[PDB]
Design a protein around this ligand. Structure first.
Ligand SMILES: Nc1ncnc2c1ncn2[C@@H]1O[C@H](COP(=O)(O)OP(=O)(O)O)[C@@H](O)[C@H]1O
Ligand SMILES: Nc1ncnc2c1ncn2[C@@H]1O[C@H](COP(=O)(O)OP(=O)(O)O)[C@@H](O)[C@H]1O
Lengths: 65, 316, 794, 316
């Protein structure tokens, strides 16, 4: 399902790092090949924070502010 | 309940059969095809009796009045023809539908006709003259079938908009809009009064103040499921599953104990709704089965098909 | 299934094994869409699980089959070429055998690994033939529903319709079909969408179409989907996008499931009200703005499927990925490609299942040029004719490549061209066969009447002088009548190859210049001679296609008297898709104007603002229409060019833009332009036949000679003109009297004792002898003198 | 039994009509004439349906199959045309079989056909391919009519040599050579099983060990006599006289109780063979009558004639 992930070493490490950076309210970036698991790790880190709500945004090559 | 030994296989049509019905009195059966021919057979002896030409394109539906003296047919040429069955003549013709008419039915009062067409509306005609008197509108797509209730004070129409609308004849108001199917609704059928109480037993529906359980209705669709609705409340009492293709016809057993249906899975299925006891299956035809009908009194069933043959099964 | 638990640990490994291979073989260094991620393994497990949900009991064989089917639906579709496909199939079977040593290979690994939920109520395997029969019947119903345009059902169609049905059954199912235009992507999508109850909705792109129009279209489709819930098959085409704003709007709609800010101000409030009413109808009680917005977004995600159809243009894949990653991330990619030789062979046989191609004495050659991969090596005549048909279609591709390598623009070859070629072949076969049979019938009955006349005159001889005179005069023609009757069998023998060559010429070589047309025809003839296919050589195509009767009308209708112009007129006469005239000079324009002048042909242009009204008038009146300035093509013509008619019990009905109008059977439309070097939109490339009115060296040489003889020697030019017309009139009269003789001879059912027959036959023989006298004298004493004057100026 | 009043007299052909047959399943009649055209009529309402001008010269005989989907026709152009009654176009035209082919027939197996001509032989063709495999010889002159038995294991041929031969399909031997007519035999016909037992008391034929009365055949000739023959014994069971000219067609009533004949006497005659009670004669046409046919189920008969008029009659 979209809302499930088997806890693996990489997942728990990256989720902890993202939680550390997000609790500090510091903007950040995840650079990896498509399908690596960047979005799922982000949502797993975010759901730990209960006062934290996300808004999606998709960037094309013809986007403006 | 019909069983696998078919009694007769009547094959005279040159095109797929669309509708087959029983004359309410005489021991004679009628089948409409896509070759514009209303061929009239005899089911007791398995003998052709006489054809009825007159329409220009495929006949989509046929119906008899309460006395059986009149046969109203609707064709794909946007024409509804009335037939003096005693004389086998077309005494009147009616036009007015933008696209082909795909349904027809006579009010039990015997003084009006209703028809449904691809022009997304239902028309009502008077028998004495042939002039349209009412026009039910509100469907957003092709209306496949219209069938009034027993006393004629309500009608029900299914359409390609995946909804079934129950209309009031007196004031044209849309009494109900039953929409839970996931595909095009192909066929509907009212519940005979004799089954009313039995219905309340199967679904456990509770009675209201007046004591009338509320008229019930069946809807078959291309979603391979047959739903059953309570008009008085507008809620889906139950769903029936098991067909392997689009349901084409569905009807109640005269005893109010089984539901007969035919689909494009080449099977006639007899289902049980009270105890879910019987789920009998019949390999009715070698191709799609377009329509069925159960005689009110005599223990016979007829099914049309796309393989250009009609079949008669005996009930035992 | 508490019987395959022990198979959990092998299955996983196998998947991973196979998955790893797809990462180390199909790199993105080859095509931009060869990206395989754990997301593929996620949708793999999801597909296997969904295929296992309703089903009760299943052996290991069924599990392996489902696993292989899913891997083929995830790793065999985005591939572009067949070599990679064969590699994928080999390795899928190999890994399945490796990870399950004790398995029944045939039961699990059959070749047509198909699954459907149409025949049954549960997603289960289906045999190919039953699926073909069922889809044939359903397509017969679909025709009456929409798109009376017929479709052939070959193996590929079935695979693609199954894939598209799979995708439409998913909650947020976005599909991206890459295949050559006309291959059937749109019609297959509409067919399967109708099967699934989806209300197909396509944008009506036009010349004025701008960002605001597309935003309004998105508002319409979203309002229909979210509120007033109804499934929608929103079909977009790579040409229907004009601005990058369309691409970014589609990107956000696909990815997010809802475009933000589309409903602004009043639209926001109206949508909020409509969503509230829909929630009350459904049963949910919502009042807050964001709750209703989230409900609407969920409904849109659930009940809106976008099908993007795009052309396999190299270096356009990477650009399209860059400008909109959603197409390559939130859309499953189906590579339709171009019809394989197998597909072309199947459609050829299916349409030429009515032709009398059987030849029992067809001698199989020592060498046969095999084009179809599965051609039976002892093939019958039909299996060689269809083989040569697919060879011709493959020859067009080589010709296009040769023109591109050394030359200018080449027009793309599409399966619609093959469909037109086959339709022309069938129609031409029926017409030529009917004409030859009728001619032989008339000749035989006339000869029988002549034999009865011989009986009469002989039994009178055993009033006589006239009988013997007419006997001799009629035998002077009976000699050639008997020659023709004897050669009737030979003509019937070679009617297959000739109709094939003529159809291939009038269906394919409509764009090329004279040299390329001759080269294509020569190659086709060489191949047919290789396959020992009978065809009457030494007969010009233009004479075979068109008789002299209509050639006289064409020449009198201001048409140059040359081979190329005659062939172009033939193409204008016999056409399935409406023509497109590409002429530098304007000659074809007045040619068409005069030819259809009697029908009140109207002149109109795309640029003209009344173009719609005139068009509508024609569509409701059945009068011919000629449209110029095709460069600024108006896509509202797309339905009428594809004949998207709808039978209404006797009236064919066509939708232009958004308004629906009845069609008249007498409606014919022509398209033209004056720019030989101009590029047309890709959507119009495959929707219309092409006729190129180029200048021939011989055609120009004739024009120069005619003009120089008109100026230098007006007297000789006058003689030339009056003898040429006089000769044409003699040929017209020759055909008239000759045919009337046969017609009268057939009509009489008595004998020579009839008073009218004798006088008619004597006057006819006298008249034709006198006409031959003038013909021979003018071709001897006056044509030779004219030739000498033109010879010195040649 | 056919009675005085002709129901319809359909006149569309430009040449003398040769043979008229019924479609096995549809309410459709087919006629062949000398104008190289095959016309299609609706004998129920006397309507024109279609004409097929594919043949070159005059069409002699036509024949359907059991299913009514294919129609094999023969004409004096030395060709046999296989017509698809579905697409209404030629799917095969088998060549060879020299000279005017007089008759063509589809065996009940429906996979092979037989053809008889002027070339003193009878050829059998496959529907699938059209290649000649067996070619029966032995007739000394023009062979006119050929019709197989109802199970397809035997064929019969009448010829201008005034001899009628019964051939075995399987192994190409002359099972019987009944040569007793005084003039050229023009028509032959097999007997249905429903009348075999009748034949038993009609002619006094004795049963063999197997108990079967034996396969029966008929032959009408120019000698004004109709002979009924026992294929098993090769004897002349009974000869029937009374026609004023050459007999052109003879056949059994579907009930196995009367014999129908059409002859050059411009009249059709219904005779009784078991008891010789009935000898009815009706003035069929103003000119020669070329062929006659009886509908298997409908009480309708059809007669073709040289006067280019096809007359249909009802049975009561
Ligand atoms: N540990 C995991 N558990 C579950 N799913 C996983 C795991 N790792 C990868 N996936 C799958 O891989 C895909 C990654 O999707 P997403 O997070 O959007 O990737 P990215 O952001 O890298 O493009 C999803 O299908 C996800 O379910
Ligand atoms: N398999 C097919 N058999 C017959 N006609 C086909 C087939 N595929 C496409 N066509 C024809 O092509 C046209 C539809 O093309 P369309 O599907 O709109 O093009 P595209 O492939 O660019 O999406 C119609 O004329 C249709 O009948």
């Amino acid at each position: 399902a979209p809302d499930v992930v088997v806890p693996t070493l990489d997942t728990v490490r990256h989720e902890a790092l993202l939680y550390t950076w997000l609790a500090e309210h510091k903007p950040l970036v995840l650079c990896g090949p498509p399908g690596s698991g960047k979005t799922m790790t982000l949502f797993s880190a975010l759901r730990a924070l209960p006062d934290m709500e996300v808004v999606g945004l998709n960037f094309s090559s013809a986007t403006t502010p | 309940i019909p069983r696998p030994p078919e009694k007769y296989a009547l094959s005279g049509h040159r095109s797929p059969v669309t509708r087959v019905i029983f004359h309410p009195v005489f021991s004679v059966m009628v089948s409409a095809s896509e070759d514009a021919t209303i061929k009239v057979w005899d089911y007791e002896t398995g003998d052709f009796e006489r054809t009825l030409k007159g329409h220009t394109d495929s006949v989509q539906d046929i119906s008899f009045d309460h006395s059986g003296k009149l046969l109203a047919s609707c064709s794909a040429d946007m024409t509804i023809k009335l037939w003096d069955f005693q004389g086998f003549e077309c005494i009147r013709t009616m036009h007015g539908h933008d696209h082909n008419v795909s349904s027809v039915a006579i009010m039990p009062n015997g003084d009006h006709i209703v028809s449904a067409s691809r022009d997304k509306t239902i028309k009502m005609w008077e028998v004495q003259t042939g002039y349209c008197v009412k026009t039910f509108t509100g469907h957003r797509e092709w209306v496949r079938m219209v069938r009034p209730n027993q006393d004629g004070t309500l009608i029900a129409s299914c359409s390609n908009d995946q909804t079934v609308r129950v209309w009031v004849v007196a004031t044209k108001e849309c009494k109900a809009e039953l929409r839970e199917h996931e595909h095009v609704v192909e066929c509907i059928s009212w519940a005979p009064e004799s089954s009313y109480s039995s219905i309340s037993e199967a679904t456990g529906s509770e009675t209201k103040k007046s004591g009338k359980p509320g008229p019930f209705l069946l809807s078959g669709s291309r979603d391979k499921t047959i739903k059953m609705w309570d008009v008085s409340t507008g809620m889906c009492l139950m769903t029936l599953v098991g067909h392997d293709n689009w349901v084409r016809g569905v009807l109640f057993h005269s005893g109010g104990k089984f539901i007969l249906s035919c689909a494009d899975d080449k099977t006639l299925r007899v289902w049980d709704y009270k105890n879910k006891r019987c789920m009998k299956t019949l390999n009715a035809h070698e191709h799609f089965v377009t329509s069925l009908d159960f005689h009110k009194t005599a223990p016979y069933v007829v099914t049309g098909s796309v393989d250009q043959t009609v079949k008669v099964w005996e009930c035992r | 299934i508490p019987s395959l638990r022990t198979y959990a640990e092998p299955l996983t490994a196998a998947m991973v094994e196979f998955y790893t291979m797809s990462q180390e073989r199909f790199t993105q260094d080859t095509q931009p869409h060869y990206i395989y991620s754990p997301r593929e393994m996620t949708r793999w497990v999801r597909g296997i699980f969904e295929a296992l949900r309703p089903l009760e009991t299943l052996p290991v064989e069924g599990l392996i089959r489902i696993w292989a089917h899913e891997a083929l639906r995830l790793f065999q579709d985005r591939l572009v070429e067949d070599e990679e496909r064969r590699w994928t199939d080999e390795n899928i079977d190999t890994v399945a055998l490796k990870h399950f040593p004790n398995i029944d290979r045939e039961k699990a690994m059959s070749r047509p690994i198909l699954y459907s939920n149409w025949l049954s109520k549960d997603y289960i395997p289906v045999d190919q033939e039953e699926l073909r029969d069922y889809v044939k019947a359903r397509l017969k119903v679909f025709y009456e529903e929409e798109l009376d345009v017929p479709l052939v059902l070959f193996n590929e169609v079935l695979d693609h319709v199954l894939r598209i049905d799979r995708i439409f059954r998913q909650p947020q199912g976005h599909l991206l079909l890459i295949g050559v235009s006309g291959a059937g992507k749109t019609t297959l999508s509409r067919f399967v969408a109708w099967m699934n109850g989806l209300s197909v909705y396509q944008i009506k792109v036009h010349r004025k179409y701008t960002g605001e129009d597309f935003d309004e279209d998105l508002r319409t489709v979203l309002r229909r989907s979210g509120c007033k819930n109804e499934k929608i098959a929103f079909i977009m085409d790579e040409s229907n996008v004009l601005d990058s704003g369309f691409l970014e709007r589609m990107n956000t709609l696909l990815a997010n499931g809802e475009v933000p800010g589309l409903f602004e101000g009043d639209e926001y409030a109206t949508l909020m009200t409509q969503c509230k009413e829909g929630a009350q109808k459904e049963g949910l009680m919502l009042d807050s703005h964001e709750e209703l917005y989230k409900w609407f977004t969920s409904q849109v995600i659930r009940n809106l499927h976008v099908v993007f159809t795009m052309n396999p243009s190299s270096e356009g894949l990477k650009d399209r990925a860059a400008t909109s990653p959603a197409l390559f991330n939130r859309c499953v990619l189906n590579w339709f490609g171009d019809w394989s030789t197998e597909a072309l062979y199947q459609v050829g046989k299916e349409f030429t299942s009515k032709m009398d191609l059987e030849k029992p004495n067809y001698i199989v050659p020592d060498y046969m040029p095999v084009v179809y991969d599965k051609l039976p090596q002892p093939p019958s005549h039909r299996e060689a004719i269809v083989n040569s048909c697919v060879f011709v279609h493959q020859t067009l591709h080589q010709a296009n490549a040769r023109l591109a390598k050394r030359g200018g623009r080449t027009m793309a070859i599409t399966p619609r061209h093959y469909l037109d070629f086959i339709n022309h072949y069938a129609n031409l076969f029926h017409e030529k066969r009917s004409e030859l049979e009728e001619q032989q019938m008339h000749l035989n009955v006339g000869l029988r009447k002549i034999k009865e006349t011989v009986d009469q005159v002989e039994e009178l001889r055993r009033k006589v002088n006239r009988s013997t005179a007419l006997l001799k005069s009629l035998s002077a023609e009976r000699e050639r009548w008997e020659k023709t009757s004897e050669t009737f069998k030979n003509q019937m023998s070679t009617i297959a190859g000739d109709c094939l060559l003529s159809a291939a010429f009038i269906a394919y070589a409509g764009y090329f210049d004279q040299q390329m047309r001759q080269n294509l025809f020569t190659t086709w003839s060489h191949h047919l001679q290789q396959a020992n296919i009978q065809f009457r050589t030494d007969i010009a195509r233009t004479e075979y296609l068109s008789n002299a009767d209509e050639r006289l009308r064409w020449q009198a209708s201001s048409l140059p008297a040359d081979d190329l112009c005659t062939e172009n007129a033939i193409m204008l006469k016999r056409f399935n898709r409406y023509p497109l005239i590409i002429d530098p000079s304007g000659q074809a324009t007045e040619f068409i104007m005069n030819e259809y002048k009697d029908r009140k042909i109207t002149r109109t242009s795309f640029l003209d603002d009344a173009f719609r009204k005139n068009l509508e008038s024609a569509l409701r009146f059945g009068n011919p229409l000629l449209v110029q300035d095709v460069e600024s093509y108006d896509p509202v013509l797309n339905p009428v060019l594809n004949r998207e008619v709808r039978r209404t019990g006797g009236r064919v009905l066509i939708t232009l833009g958004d308004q629906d109008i009845d069609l008249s059977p007498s409606f014919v439309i022509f398209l033209s332009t004056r720019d030989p070097t101009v590029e047309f939109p890709p959507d119009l490339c495959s929707r219309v036949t092409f006729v190129n009115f180029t200048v021939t060296r011989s055609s120009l040489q004739s024009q120069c000679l005619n003009e120089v003889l008109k100026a230098e020697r007006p007297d000789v030019d006058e003689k030339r003109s009056d003898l040429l017309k006089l000769q044409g009139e003699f040929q017209l009269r020759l055909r008239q009297l000759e045919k009337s003789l046969l017609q009268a001879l057939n009509e009489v059912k008595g004998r020579i004792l009839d008073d009218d027959t004798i006088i008619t036959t004597l006057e006819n023989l006298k008249r034709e002898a006198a006409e031959v006298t003038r013909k021979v004298e003018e071709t001897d004493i006056v044509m030779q003198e004219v030739e000498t004057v033109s010879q010195q100026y040649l």
